[PDB]
């Protein structure tokens, strides 16, 4: 609002028969300059539950210090109890409530997701703290590009194997490629699954640049 | 904010202005009578802006009455009505938005008395009997409670003293003086003022 | 705003060979009403009625302009006007005034001169046709007028089941407003009758 | 510079039979023009006798609720009672006011029924004014699904019909018809609306869907 | 928007990005900023969209009619000046930062320069658009003197491979243009064929 | 109100939903805007609703004006440039996103005319809102030079795309296929919006009226 | 929203409509516009629904606190003046309300007028409301202080009857109030149309 | 837009107040009475804004009263117009601006009548004969043509008829009754209102 | 206002030009945006002047005593992480758009970017300032992989000769600091000892 602040463009997310993966792009951009490439975007948590951020990527530092140390305080508690991502996202959603209504808001815009002892989660929460669950997520702009791609083969059915859902973020994600214009090439793609949180990266966008030369 | 009335008999229809000339802060003469005389039976009355009644209002007392005197009969007050609502409705977005509102008391003689209203966009529509100003939202329901359609000339200006008694009362400006003008089958007369 | 100037609802839905127009007779400032009467659907044809909300200037202006571009159309050229072709002459009155535009939504509705097959139409301010066989609306309350009005049409309705519909949807639609109501206006446009009608509202 | 609101949308309805209480609801909350999900629900269960609706901007919809749910429990085991209805009502409207110079936007339709069995349905402005009813929907479609049930409910604006009481059977067929309505008619319409329906026995929930675009 | 125009000798070479965004989105990934408006006068086209191009089909229409009014191919410097003249008149209604180049038979090489505000300077390389900011190091460091035409090739080629790579409102494919005697040989770029530079990791 | 167009091998299909939203509620549920202009050239149109209308009389006017003055068959390289010219001297006031195509004597291409003057040839286009509900299904499963039933097919889930996730939804999709030879201007092609049902009769019969004053009127 | 309320030799009438817009769309046709804080006295609302219910609300709290503080009756200035106190240290933050505090105490038939920028004034008439004006109108033209119960009780009716047929923002029901040396009661619940059509 | 007005005179000071409580377009109750009791001799007025004339004001006379009934004697005028200057004036910057103009009648036994003013920032000042309101600027020279600096009571009395009337007259505003109130070396008397 | 730093082995090399415009007025041709802050770690400044010293001897004062707390030289990481709390949480405040370099003895070269709306984050060269826009081609292009000092030297020499070159807001001397294991070796360019490439002629 003041200045030009250090963003990213978008964490796209679907579950699947399995865990859920979610994926963003390394960039630091600041206002139409990539001023950092090699800029992680996807916070790893305990062992069931992952985190992402599309806004400003200060605040997400911010969130990686406060989400870091509850994590690892209740973490060492013993007695188990690790945290469900209900409580990632009733938090985070809490937090960033309780933070817009005081006028100081955070300003970017995430999706968590993890693997729960029954079945998997991914949970959107907004800047302005409208927070919801969804079979399948975008930010930003991919939330009107990468949504429809999600939200299609979803519709046709509502069950994925790991590789139908990894190759469909990583489509989704050349396709943000493609038109997003904050969006660069390589990218983290991050999967949770019933062996854990793990994390991919950086991969790679095969274009297709094939149609450039009809243009007269 | 200043005050035109008017009530429509069975046949005639009777208009009051208030007789005070504002300022900033002042007034100034009482009289400056509002109501500007049409060809013989039609009879405008005008407050708004203060520089746009003496000036639109008589533009169109020049049109009717270069009407009359030209083509021998007088307009119909529907007619004069019409044309001043489309002079000021086509005056009113071009470039010098005339800030009047307007009452016209007339009667045509083979139809009864009319007395027609509009605001300070020109949308015209009859009325058995209409207000203006800030006076207007007081007065109002006094022409309601009391009016019947079919009303005797005496009743009516009794009614009238009672709207203007209550607008003696009630509202903050000081309008001590009230022009009353019956206009009816024999040309337009006077009523004598109702003062206070 | 400036669409709630004045206030005005009219809407027209169709059934079998007649149509329906309704307004709501009533006139004033915004918390005022300065009278009850109020012309608002302003016969063109024999059986085509156009009617107009909004700004009231506007509707007198444009329903002036239209019955002086209408009526010398039809002195042009001897015929009633096909309706189809009177709104492409409103599609063509409140555009090419587009910039300072006129503050009004009229609707059309009636009959084929020779056929008789009825349709109703709606335009936005600037200008747009919307052609229509279930309903249209125009006025500050729209979406009561929809959404009432869109729960009880069925279709192919002979003129009373019509007259009692749009009885009840001006009715309960416009009772639900503010700047509106006041007793209603209904014209019921068969092929061999205008059933005009007013009702008794709610008048306060 | 920051616009702390926007409009997430949803309609939801409730109605007051004489032993039931039917609080509709909806389920596309969305903003801007991208739909964000398709499942959420709308009406809350408070108690086992009274259903929220919560309309609005979702967030604060969403953070309402948790405050009216976790001071119904800070009630009912600081007396040794469940809240009633108008208490709910009573509460509610001090919550919403309480908050006023940073104002909880939300349109809220508290459903359920009363003390001796009778249903009731209070209605709230986003700053809190609650009178009881039979009807009222509210929140983004208000002003469409009002006039049908001014009428079908009401029976305003209309002659001898001799009209009878409400009941599960035609009242349940008088929420489907004015969604799918609002379907074709609102841009903020859902999809499938999940009527939390209240009885004197208890409370079920039927889903229905509608026009899904 | 990102354009090059290097002079090297004789004739020139020309070089434009590919994007149009509206804002954050890139509404065509696929476009020429590259225009033909003679023979081998090209013109480019910079900052806004609308505007330039209804220049560039104006001095079109004036700069052909003037080409065959006296029947001899046109200077550089007549189509640059009414350049100067057809933006500067109307200043405060374009965003038309475009640099022009082309062969005329009677000097050679000419690249000229017509900025946002309206203007005409002779260059011997240009430079304008919105990456290109990113890239005066790069080509302030580069371009020596009097070079050839395949090191002009890949010096606009990894130039604005550069600034497509760095910038968010410039990407996709590169045209390149090489006016000279011959006519224009253009090509574009696809994919693998921009020089890919390596980013630097475990940073 | 998502637009869109492909061209293929034959031709082209353009595509929209039908559907104009004034404010947020639907003032009108079946409208067309695929617009004639000629008969090998439709437009489309999405932004102000009545300005694509009268720029597409006013050009479709012009156009069949002009060709009719040269005999031929109008080629679609003068309406992309009587739009674009026409459409820039009023300075982006009217807003008319729309796209165009056309099978001219040169080849079958379209056009997209933002609303302040600025022409794209491509070979897929998508105005509106619905653009961003209709292009990703552009990139994944659009291929070049294919064949007609699934271009068809591929237009079809673009504006069903804009349908089913996007706030300027349709009812139905109607999309015109113009080919070489033949023009197909089909209306809806698939309906995925039924109106639903009602439940119960509603009226009595010279009922539940409040006549204050009736008249009648003869007419013939 | 049109209230009024005027004394006279047997208590005072308090009278309002029960309509409550919304700008311009309107939310109930049957709104209690009436607070009754206790058996003795009454309070009116005249805009901003939440604001006026909740501070009359909270008066009845106070007032209810000085009934078993003092063991009293409260006067009806002391309500209506610390009404004021209240919405005065809320003035300038956008509060808007307005209200007759009536009610027969000790000394008198009471009718104080308190609003939101806090003018706190005694009064023999008043009328507070959106249109309102045409109230006191058609209230001042058929007002005397020697009336019986009946005639004003149709001075009642038809004075707010007009105050809400030529407003917009008014109408729906009248509800109407007579309170005395033994409190408040209700004498009337009707609307609008059967006013009109008994009256014509 | 109300209207204060005071004379001095050679042994007491006599106040009138415009007897009418104003609002948006109506006016309320006449009476509503502006001259607030002080102790036994003083006696202020306060206009301006409606809801600061009736809250400090009524303050100003809690805390004189306290003074008076806490430590016997009451204050001289002085010393109340110097407080209550004190206590606007501080008042005036901080929080909530009270935005009162207020005249302060008074005497003292072993020394003159005083009329003090002040404006709404809390400038003080004493004068002969003051004014307040937008009914100040026409009523003043009437005050200045005819104040001797020693008049007698019945002279000041219908000299302040003559300044009433005048404002009753030209100014605007319906102000028809007036509240006056000679106070002198016997204690806070009042004289019959005037109207018209 | 254009710094850069890269991390060549072992130690870093920073480099910052010379200019304090007050918007079109050199109010200051010679200043120096390296600073020490304890031994090793410098940090530069950028953007604003007269934020960023404040928050400079702010962390002289807190590095300073942590690392006199614990007696032992402290990394990198730790100067880097208490600018990103303190400029993060005056972040509406403060235009400090500062990169932090040094040689911890535990890791090694470290450069560190705290940009203006105040963050951390690990780069191999850094780059920041006014005129650090003009030359992401240049470093983007010409830095391979783990070059020297000398090398890099030269080449933190002329890329900020070219942002000196090419910005109005950025001229001057530069001043060149190679942070290594034996301390700081830091020298200036005086005028002719900056590398003046040929403009090109029309």
């Not at chain 2, 009530?7 to 509002?34: C, E, F, T």
């Not at chain 4, 609650?130 to 983004?140: I, V």
């Not at chain 5, 590919?18 to 065509?28: C, K, L, M, P, V």
Request: aromatic letters at 10%; glycine letters at 8%.
């Amino acid at each position: 609002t003041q200045n030009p602040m250090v963003t990213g463009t978008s964490v796209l997310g679907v579950k699947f028969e399995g865990g859920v993966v979610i994926a963003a792009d390394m960039l630091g951009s600041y206002g139409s300059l990539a001023r950092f490439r090699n800029i992680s975007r996807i916070m790893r948590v305990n062992n069931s539950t992952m985190l992402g951020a599309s806004g400003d990527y200060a605040d997400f530092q911010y969130l990686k210090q406060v989400l870091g140390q509850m994590v690892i305080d209740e973490e060492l508690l013993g007695d188990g109890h690790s945290y469900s991502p209900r409580a990632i996202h009733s938090w985070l959603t809490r937090a960033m409530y309780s933070r817009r209504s005081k006028m100081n808001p955070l300003w970017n815009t995430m999706v968590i997701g993890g693997y729960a002892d029954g079945e998997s989660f991914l949970g959107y929460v907004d800047m302005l703290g409208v927070a919801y669950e969804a079979p399948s997520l975008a930010t930003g702009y991919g939330a009107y590009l990468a949504q429809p791609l999600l939200r299609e083969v979803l519709e046709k059915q509502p069950v994925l194997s790991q590789t139908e859902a990894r190759d469909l973020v990583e489509r989704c994600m050349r396709v943000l490629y493609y038109r997003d214009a904050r969006s660069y090439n390589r990218f983290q793609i991050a999967t949770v699954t019933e062996k854990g949180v793990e994390i991919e990266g950086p991969l790679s966008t095969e274009t297709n640049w094939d149609i450039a030369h009809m243009i007269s | 904010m200043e005050y035109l009335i008017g009530i429509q008999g069975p046949d005639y229809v009777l208009v009051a202005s208030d007789r005070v000339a504002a300022s900033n802060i002042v007034q100034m003469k009482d009289d400056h009578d509002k109501m500007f005389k049409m060809s013989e039976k039609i009879l405008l009355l005008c407050v708004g802006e203060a520089g746009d009644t003496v000036q639109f209002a008589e533009y169109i007392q020049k049109n009717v009455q270069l009407y009359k005197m030209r083509n021998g009969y007088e307009l119909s007050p529907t007619a004069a009505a019409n044309f001043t609502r489309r002079n000021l409705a086509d005056c009113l977005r071009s470039r010098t938005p005339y800030h009047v509102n307007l009452l016209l008391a007339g009667y045509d003689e083979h139809e009864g008395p009319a007395l027609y209203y509009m605001d300070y966009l020109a949308a015209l529509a009859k009325a058995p009997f209409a207000a203006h100003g800030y006076g207007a939202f007081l007065t109002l329901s006094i022409l309601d409670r009391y009016y019947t359609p079919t009303i005797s000339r005496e009743r009516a200006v009794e009614l009238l003293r009672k709207c203007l008694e209550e607008l003696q009362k009630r509202f903050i400006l000081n309008l001590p003086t009230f022009s009353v003008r019956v206009i009816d089958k024999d040309g337009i007369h006077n009523l004598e003022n109702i003062a206070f | 705003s400036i669409m709630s100037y004045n206030g005005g609802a009219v809407m027209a839905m169709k059934g079998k060979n007649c149509v329906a127009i309704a307004a709501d007779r009533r006139f004033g400032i915004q918390a005022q009403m300065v009278t009850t009467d109020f012309q608002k659907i302003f016969p063109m044809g024999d059986r085509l009625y156009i009617g107009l909300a909004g700004l009231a200037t506007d509707v007198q202006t444009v329903a002036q302009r239209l019955k002086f571009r209408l009526n010398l159309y039809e002195l042009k050229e001897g015929r009633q006007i096909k309706p189809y072709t009177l709104m492409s002459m409103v599609a063509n009155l409140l555009y090419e005034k587009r910039f300072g535009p006129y503050y009004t939504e009229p609707v059309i509705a009636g009959l084929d001169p020779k056929t008789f097959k009825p349709f109703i139409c709606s335009l936005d301010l600037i200008g747009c046709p919307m052609v229509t066989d279930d309903f249209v609306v125009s006025g500050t309350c729209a979406e009561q007028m929809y959404g009432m009005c869109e729960s009880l049409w069925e279709p192919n309705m002979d003129p009373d089941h019509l007259f009692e519909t749009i009885s009840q949807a001006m009715l309960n639609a416009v009772d639900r407003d503010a700047v509106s109501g006041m007793g209603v206006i209904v014209h019921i446009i068969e092929k061999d009758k205008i059933t005009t009608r007013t009702l008794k509202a709610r008048m306060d | 510079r920051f616009s702390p609101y926007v409009f997430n949308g949803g309609t939801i309805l409730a109605i007051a039979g004489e032993d039931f209480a039917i609080v509709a609801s909806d389920t596309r909350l969305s903003e801007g023009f991208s739909i964000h999900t398709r499942d959420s629900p709308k009406c809350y269960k408070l108690t086992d006798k009274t259903v929220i609706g919560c309309s609005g901007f979702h967030g604060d919809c969403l953070t309402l609720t948790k405050i009216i749910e976790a001071r119904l429990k800070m009630y009912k085991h600081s007396n040794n009672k469940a809240m009633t209805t108008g208490a709910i009502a009573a509460m509610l409207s001090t919550i919403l006011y309480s908050r006023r110079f940073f104002p909880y936007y939300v349109y809220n339709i508290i459903g359920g029924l009363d003390e001796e069995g009778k249903g009731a349905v209070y209605s709230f402005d986003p700053v809190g004014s609650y009178q009881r009813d039979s009807f009222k929907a509210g929140g983004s479609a208000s002003a469409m699904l009002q006039p049908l049930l001014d009428n079908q409910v009401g029976f305003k604006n209309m002659q001898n019909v001799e009209h009878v009481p409400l009941s599960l059977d035609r009242a349940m067929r008088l929420v489907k018809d004015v969604f799918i309505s609002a379907a074709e008619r609102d841009v903020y319409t859902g999809d499938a609306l999940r009527i939390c329906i209240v009885t004197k026995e208890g409370i079920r929930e039927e889903t229905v869907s509608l026009r899904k675009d | 928007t990102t354009i090059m125009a290097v002079q090297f000798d004789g004739g020139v070479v020309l070089g434009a990005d590919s994007r149009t965004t509206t804002g954050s989105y890139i509404a065509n990934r696929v476009t020429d900023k590259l225009t033909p408006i003679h023979d081998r006068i090209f013109c480019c086209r910079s900052g806004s969209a609308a505007d330039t191009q209804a220049v560039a089909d104006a001095v079109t229409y004036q700069l052909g009619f003037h080409s065959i009014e006296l029947n001899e191919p046109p200077l550089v410097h007549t189509a640059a000046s009414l350049f100067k003249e057809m933006c500067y008149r109307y200043r405060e209604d374009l965003m038309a930062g475009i640099i022009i180049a082309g062969w005329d038979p009677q000097e050679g090489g000419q690249v000229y320069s017509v900025p946002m505000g309206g203007m005409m300077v002779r260059q011997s390389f240009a430079i304008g658009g919105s990456g290109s900011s990113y890239i005066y190091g790069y080509v302030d460091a580069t371009y020596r003197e009097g070079m050839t035409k395949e090191e002009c090739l890949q010096f606009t080629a990894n130039a604005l491979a550069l600034a497509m790579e760095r910038d968010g409102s410039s990407g996709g494919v590169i045209r390149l243009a090489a006016i000279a005697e011959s006519g224009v040989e253009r090509q574009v770029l696809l994919g693998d064929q921009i020089p890919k530079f390596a980013v630097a990791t475990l940073p | 109100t998502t637009i869109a167009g492909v061209v293929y091998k034959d031709g082209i299909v353009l595509g929209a939903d039908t559907r104009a939203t004034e404010g947020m509620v639907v003032a009108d549920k079946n409208c067309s805007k695929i617009h004639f202009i000629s008969p090998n050239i439709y437009c489309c149109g999405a932004g102000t609703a009545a300005d694509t209308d009268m720029t597409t009389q006013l050009i479709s006017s012009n156009l069949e004006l002009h060709s009719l003055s040269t005999g031929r068959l109008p080629r679609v390289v003068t309406a992309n440039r009587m739009l674009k010219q026409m459409l820039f001297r009023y300075q982006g006031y009217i807003g008319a996103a729309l796209v165009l195509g056309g099978v001219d004597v040169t080849g079958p291409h379209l056009y997209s005319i933002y609303p302040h003057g600025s022409t794209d040839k491509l070979p897929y286009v998508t105005m509106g809102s619905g653009s961003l509900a209709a292009m990703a299904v552009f990139e994944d499963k659009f291929r070049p030079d294919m064949e007609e039933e699934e271009a068809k097919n591929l237009v079809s889930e673009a504006i069903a795309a804009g349908i089913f996730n996007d706030l300027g939804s349709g009812s139905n999709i109607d999309l015109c296929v113009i080919s070489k030879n033949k023009l197909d201007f089909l209306r809806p092609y698939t309906v995925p919006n039924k109106k639903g049902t009602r439940l119960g009769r509603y009226r009595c019969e010279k009922g539940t009226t409040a006549v204050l004053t009736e008249k009648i009127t003869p007419l013939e | 929203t049109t209230t009024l309320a005027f004394k006279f030799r047997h208590g005072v009438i308090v009278a309002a409509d029960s309509r409550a817009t919304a700008g311009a769309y309107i939310a109930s046709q049957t709104v209690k516009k009436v607070i009754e804080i206790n058996p003795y006295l009454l309070g009116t609302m005249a805009g901003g629904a939440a604001d006026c219910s909740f501070w009359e609300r909270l008066l009845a709290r106070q007032c209810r606190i000085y009934e078993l503080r003092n063991k009293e009756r409260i006067s009806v200035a002391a309500a209506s003046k610390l009404l004021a106190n209240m919405v005065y240290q809320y003035k300038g933050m956008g509060l808007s309300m307005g209200t007759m505090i009536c009610g027969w105490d000790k000394r008198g038939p009471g009718l104080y007028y308190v609003d939101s920028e806090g003018n706190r004034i005694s009064g023999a008439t008043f009328s507070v409301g959106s249109g309102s004006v045409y109230a006191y109108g058609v209230m001042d033209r058929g007002y005397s202080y020697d009336l019986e119960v009946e005639q004003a009780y149709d001075l009642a009716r038809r004075a707010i009857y007009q105050a809400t047929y030529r407003d917009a923002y008014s109408g729906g029901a009248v509800n109407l109030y007579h309170v005395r040396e033994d409190g408040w009661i209700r004498v009337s619940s009707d609307n609008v149309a059967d006013l009109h059509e008994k009256y014509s």
